[PDB]
Amino acid sequence: GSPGIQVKALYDYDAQTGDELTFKEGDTIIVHQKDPAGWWEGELNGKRGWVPANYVQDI
């Protein structure tokens, strides 16, 4: 199957650090880990980084 859990972004987000992902509503984020504390390890367009879990569809 896919290398991870694919989820849709619900809103645009602009990264506030170099280790966060920037994305737009409708992007498909690959989730690698559902880390505790509100930020998940994800991947988009060849970059690995943190995604705010409240910005992607469901949990």
Binding site: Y11, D12, Y13, T17, A37, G38, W39, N54
Partner: peptide, 10 residues
């Protein structure tokens, strides 16, 4: 539409 606030990063 309005967005949730990102949670603390620390």
């Amino acid at each position: 539409r309005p967005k949730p606030v990102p949670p603390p990063r620390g």
